Design a protein around this ligand. Structure first.
Ligand SMILES: O=C(O)CNC(=O)C(=O)O
Ligand SMILES: [Mg+2]
Ligand code: NI
Ligand SMILES: [Zn+2]
Length: 331
């Protein structure tokens, strides 16, 4: 078995290997990359996502989210307070202000220490989940707006034609902006490209051990667990590496820098934080190997997780028993 300790693997495809996206994902899995839940892909040196980032300041962040924490430093939830609209140029200036800017630090490890010590005492503002793309239309390789769609994959594998669309999302971050522990909708893959700015640190639990993280989360968030049998779908809970180590949960960590891709694999729980002002683009995707994970994915039916239009068909076709209850949650 390849990669039996479930380490995060880093790949350096050549420009020739960067042509065929599906083939390269299947290659990475042949080497065991999926066992970690997360992989890094460094693009060939010839490749670029677009020519420059000099003209992005007028993108609108219609609903910036202030991430307010509750709990203790290593075990907390966050809620998202909606703020007034602002442009990316306005948000960049805010991220760089004395109130929000990255503190002085020695290296990524010192910054990580500072994040876990101090995150809860601040409420950073995240421009998350903005439909759109920063890939030039002429970028032919690993263009996250030109991937094969999940609906087309389901149709190719299973023969059923379904409604729905699959488009990318932009994320504008600042110091301490946080992504809570989650797997993707329907335990899909994700791919995330860091277009510009400061790094993003990731934590990940191997898919084969995801239920260990879930059992810890039920212990640590006991009211949330009684409220919903899949409350991590709410994407609000944080657990630090120190707490994971104290409870024996297998995980790994890695820092993504500008110009790098990350792939999350089906049922790979992940969480993390931004180091400073940045912009990432991400989208979900599927392969043949995903289908079985989609059939088994948990679902939130309490009403909190409220998701996209396109998830309807995935539930309806892959999980017809759960369909009725899940749809009641969505309505
Ligand atoms: O970058 C972020 O805030 C969160 N991204 C992801 O969870 C992802 O790409 O799957
Ligand atoms: Mg602009
Ligand atoms: Ni994710
Ligand atoms: Zn729920």
């Amino acid at each position: 078995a390849q990669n039996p300790n479930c380490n995060i693997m880093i790949f350096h495809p050549t420009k020739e290997e960067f042509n065929d996206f599906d083939k390269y994902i299947a290659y990475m899995e042949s080497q065991g990359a999926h066992r970690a839940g997360l992989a890094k892909i460094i693009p060939p040196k010839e490749w670029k996502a677009r020519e420059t980032y000099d003209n992005i300041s007028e993108i609108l962040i219609a609903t910036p989210l202030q991430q307010v924490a509750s709990g203790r430093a290593g075990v907390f939830t966050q809620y998202h307070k909606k703020k007034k609209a602002m442009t990316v140029g306005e948000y960049r200036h805010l991220a760089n202000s004395k109130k929000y800017q990255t503190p002085p630090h020695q290296n990524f490890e010192d910054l990580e220490r500072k994040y876990w010590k101090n995150r809860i005492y601040n409420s950073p503002i995240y421009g998350a989940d903005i439909s759109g793309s920063l890939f030039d239309e002429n970028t032919k390789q690993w263009n996250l707006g030109h991937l094969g769609t999940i609906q087309d994959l389901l149709e190719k594998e299973c023969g059923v034609v379904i409604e729905g669309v699959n488009t990318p999302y932009l994320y504008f971050g600042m110091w301490k902006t946080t992504f809570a522990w989650h797997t993707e909708d329907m335990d899909l893959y994700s791919i995330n490209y860091l277009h510009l700015g400061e790094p993003k640190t990731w934590y990940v639990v191997p898919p084969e051990h995801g239920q260990r993280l879930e059992r810890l989360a039920r212990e640590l968030f006991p009211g949330s667990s009684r409220g919903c049998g899949a409350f991590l779908r709410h994407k609000v809970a944080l657990i630090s590496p120190t707490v994971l180590k104290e409870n024996g949960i297998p995980f790994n960590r890695i820092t993504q820098e500008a110009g790098e891709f990350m792939v999350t694999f089906p049922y790979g729980y992940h969480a993390g934080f931004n180091h400073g002002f940045n912009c990432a683009e991400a989208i979900n995707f599927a392969t043949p190997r995903w289908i079985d994970y989609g059939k088994m994915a948990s679902q939130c039916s309490c009403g909190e997780a409220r998701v996209t239009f396109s998830m309807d068909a995935f539930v309806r076709i892959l999980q017809p028993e759960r369909y009725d209850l899940w749809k009641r949650g969505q309505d």
